[PDB]
């Protein structure tokens, strides 16, 4: 019966502290407006561990379902982005997208070289990614392999392996397929049924600061 | 080509990937100009391990000596900046400056609360900092304590404990006092004696991009 408000926001590029600010800002607006859900169209090659963990925590504290949607086609939620997905209420992926490839490294060196992460950091992230998978009823076996084998999956593979809940071409198909689904983690201690009958979709613009920071990045 | 040139550049703020680019740009200019040395006036309260390791490496491969100068008074080379200092050909400190407090961390929570990393990663950075100090003939006992005790030192303490080589109030005093000193690490396979008699000092201005990006990180 009731008209259900759903926010859609875009989050792109490397996961850093500005990204946390984006997640925080977009989720707050949606909580304040009593939204049914917020969908985040995520496209990230990776990023920083602390900002990622802050983002997962912000999503756990969210008073509304946060749906991570790997979109548009060609996008990925690789590295830090996979933890964000796994830490969210529902994951969707568009055709031609990617998820996984999470083997921690200390970082990239001068000439194509990479700085190896010590076994402790690796084990620490295996425990954390397995825990996010277990908490959200997702495939912990496969999530470990995102690390131990730098495994990356197509949307169809991700669904089949029990890592994501939805494969969808656009917001339309996403709302239709996810309508009636229960969130994979609780919202304020209860597993919520998503009501996407009678929905109004609202798109959230990035702010000045968002646009500036990312235009400096594109250069 | 019958000149003796010392370049001076400025590096201020968080050590990030962008800080690597500045170090690379300035050192490259000095190399291409066959400078006797480059002095880097360093003021940094923190930064990222990966960028720091890349900067130490770039300094190790430098074809000219790199002198890290903690300047102006009130500056610090804390956290990532101490590693950079310890990785370089010579360290000078201005009166009222600070070196140390190098504990590795995973970063900061939503609170701004401290997220310490696993014990074994502390041990990894202890090893790394001990290596840098021993490779440059500097006190690895005090260097370890930069981490294990969060130890921070004044210039005079740093000199007495055999962590730095010079205390100087300005570039001119720095040149006078470091003249005839041997680099603490090699330059192209050889420890080199600094020749600062009759030197031309050339200041490299930070670019608009440097200042803008620094100022944005700052907040």
């Amino acid at each position: 019966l009731a008209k259900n408000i759903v926010y859609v926001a875009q989050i792109k590029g490397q996961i850093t502290s500005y990204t946390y600010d984006q997640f925080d800002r977009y989720i707050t607006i949606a909580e304040q407006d009593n939204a049914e859900a917020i969908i985040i169209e995520l496209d990230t090659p990776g990023g920083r561990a602390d900002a990622m963990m802050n983002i997962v925590q912000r999503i756990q504290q969210s008073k509304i379902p946060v749906i991570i949607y790997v979109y548009p086609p060609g996008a990925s939620a690789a590295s830090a982005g996979t933890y964000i997905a796994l830490g969210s209420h529902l994951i969707a992926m568009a055709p031609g997208t990617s998820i996984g490839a999470c083997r921690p490294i200390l970082g990239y060196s001068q000439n194509g070289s990479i700085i190896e992460a010590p076994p402790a950091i690796t084990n620490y992230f295996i425990a954390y990614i397995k825990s996010l998978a277990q908490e959200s009823g997702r495939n912990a076996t496969i999530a470990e392999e995102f690390i131990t084998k730098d495994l990356s999956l197509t949307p169809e593979e991700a669904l089949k392996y029990g890592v994501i809940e939805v494969v969808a071409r656009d917001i339309n198909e996403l709302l239709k397929k996810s309508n009636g689904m229960k969130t994979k983690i609780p919202v304020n201690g209860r597993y919520v049924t998503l009501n996407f009958t009678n929905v109004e979709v609202r798109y959230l613009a990035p702010s000045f600061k968002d646009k500036l920071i990312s235009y400096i990045t594109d250069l | 080509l019958a000149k003796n040139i010392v370049y001076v550049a400025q590096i201020k703020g968080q050590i990030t990937s962008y800080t690597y680019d500045q170090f690379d740009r300035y050192i490259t200019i000095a190399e291409q100009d066959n400078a006797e040395a480059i002095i880097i006036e360093l003021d940094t309260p923190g930064g990222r391990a990966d960028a720091m390791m890349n900067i130490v490496q770039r300094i190790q491969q430098s074809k000219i000596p790199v002198i890290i100068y903690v300047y102006p008074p009130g500056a610090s080379a804390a956290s990532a900046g101490t590693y950079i200092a310890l990785g370089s050909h010579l360290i000078a400190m201005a009166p009222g400056t600070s070196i140390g407090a190098c504990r590795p961390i995973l970063g900061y929570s939503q609170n701004g609360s401290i997220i310490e990393a696993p014990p074994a990663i502390t041990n990894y950075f202890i090893a790394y900092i001990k290596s840098l100090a021993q490779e440059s003939g500097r006190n690895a006992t005090i260097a370890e304590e930069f981490i294990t005790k969060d130890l921070s030192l004044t210039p005079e303490e740093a000199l007495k404990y055999g962590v730095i080589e010079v205390v100087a109030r300005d570039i001119n005093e720095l040149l006078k006092k470091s003249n005839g000193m041997k680099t603490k690490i090699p330059v192209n396979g050889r420890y080199v004696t600094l020749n600062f008699t009759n030197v031309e000092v050339r200041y490299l201005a930070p670019s608009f991009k440097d200042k803008l990006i620094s100022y944005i990180t700052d907040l």
Binding site: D50, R103, G107, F125, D150 | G46, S79, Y83, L106
Partner: peptide, 8 residues
């Protein structure tokens, strides 16, 4: 306080 990590 050097901040340590990222993933690929």
């Amino acid at each position: 306080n050097v901040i340590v990590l990222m993933l690929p």
